[PDB]
Design an enzyme around this catalytic site. Structure first.
Site, short mmCIF file in Angstrom:
data_model
loop_
_atom_site.label_atom_id
_atom_site.label_comp_id
_atom_site.label_asym_id
_atom_site.label_seq_id
_atom_site.Cartn_x
_atom_site.Cartn_y
_atom_site.Cartn_z
N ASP A 63 0.82 -1.20 0.00
CA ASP A 63 0.00 0.00 0.00
C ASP A 63 0.86 1.26 0.00
O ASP A 63 1.34 1.68 1.05
CB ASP A 63 -0.91 -0.02 1.24
CG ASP A 63 -1.82 1.18 1.32
OD1 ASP A 63 -1.94 1.90 0.32
OD2 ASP A 63 -2.44 1.39 2.40
N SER A 84 -0.71 15.58 -12.04
CA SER A 84 -0.96 15.22 -13.42
C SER A 84 -1.22 16.48 -14.24
O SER A 84 -1.76 17.46 -13.75
CB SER A 84 -2.16 14.27 -13.49
OG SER A 84 -2.57 14.01 -14.82
#
Length: 330
Positions: free
Chosen positions: A35, A199
């Site tokens: 994770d 992004s």
């Protein structure tokens, strides 16, 4: 040193991925959920409340000659999905894919929430976010990666998750045969303890690319792709009959649909998520309404590039002095 381990979807939907991890001496192999959005290595154990164990493999520290109780240490964690676990702490030898750390904090669960009990395939979590998020008290502990880092050939790990197929976690090297083209690297902020990056935009299907900054986290421990409501609405508007369902808890779509791809930007590069990666199947057995793999982050408070996005890429988690993230197509 290096390590290399195969990671395997837990079910036919890629709801999560498990990776075998050797703990203790002799080794006890547990299948852990790696994770990159948390920083605790915790396991089902011989200390876990018996009624809360249902099929998981447990770590038994009393059977490990290298286990040592970390005196006075406790831990307690709550995850974004409302699940939780807590317990006490041992140090022990932990190996992943041939890479060994001695003195790793292994957090032994005394209590786990129902969602963990109900998932027989996940024996615990191995956190790979920054150690500043580790919950051990009164002395915070380091992640497996943080402990291994100085010994690694290069201070990196990579995630290469498969679509409905096994994939690979590598530590200490970049497998140049595992991706196509070049890896595009992008800046990371560690301010919130995550692999947080920005992004450069998105496209839906064959549509034009929208240049827009989307701050979010690369999180292998989250199944879906969570993005701003504007972006998510633009995606699902291209699917006839798709709608956000309050009763289901997100966007659903007719199972008869063919889903468009979704592209996200990494600098000037582009990662394309095929439409099929966005299908999470019937909302209930036999239903013709299907759960969508792109969902709104509104009210999460952060955008999450979960498995839906990451499995479309070869992803480098670069733990150099200034961390960065790399993405390549594959």
């Amino acid at each position: 040193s290096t390590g290399s381990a195969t990671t395997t979807p837990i079910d036919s939907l890629d709801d999560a991925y498990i990776t075998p991890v050797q703990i203790g001496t002799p080794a006890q192999t547990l299948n852990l959920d790696f994770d990159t959005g948390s920083s605790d290595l915790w396991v089902f154990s011989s200390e876990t409340t018996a009624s809360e164990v249902d099929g998981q493999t447990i770590y038994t520290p009393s059977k490990s000659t290298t286990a040592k109780l970390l005196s006075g240490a406790t831990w307690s964690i709550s995850y974004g999905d409302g699940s939780s676990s807590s317990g006490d702490v041992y140090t022990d030898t932990v190996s992943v894919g041939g890479l060994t750390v001695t003195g790793q904090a292994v957090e032994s669960a005394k209590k786990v929430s129902s969602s963990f009990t109900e998932d027989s395939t996940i024996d615990g979590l191995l956190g790979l976010a920054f150690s500043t998020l580790n919950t051990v008290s009164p002395t915070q502990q380091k992640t497996f990666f943080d402990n291994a880092k100085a010994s690694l050939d290069s201070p990196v790990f990579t995630a290469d998750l498969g679509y409905h197929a096994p994939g690979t976690y590598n530590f200490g090297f970049i497998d140049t045969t595992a991706y196509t083209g070049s890896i595009t690297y992008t800046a990371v902020s560690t301010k919130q303890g995550f692999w947080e990056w920005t992004s450069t935009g998105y496209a839906v299907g064959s549509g034009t690319f929208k240049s827009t900054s989307i701050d979010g986290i690369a999180d292998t421990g989250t199944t879906l792709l969570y993005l701003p409501a504007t972006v998510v609405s633009a995606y699902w508007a291209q699917v006839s009959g798709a709608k956000s369902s309050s009763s289901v808890g997100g966007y659903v779509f007719p199972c008869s649909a063919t889903l468009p791809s979704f592209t996200f930007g990494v600098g000037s590069a582009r990662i394309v998520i095929p439409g099929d990666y966005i299908d999470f199947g019937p909302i209930s057995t036999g239903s013709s309404s299907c759960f969508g793999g792109i969902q709104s982050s509104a009210g999460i408070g952060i955008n999450i590039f979960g498995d839906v996005a990451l499995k479309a890429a070869f992803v480098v988690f670069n733990g150099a002095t200034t961390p960065t993230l790399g993405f390549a197509s594959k």
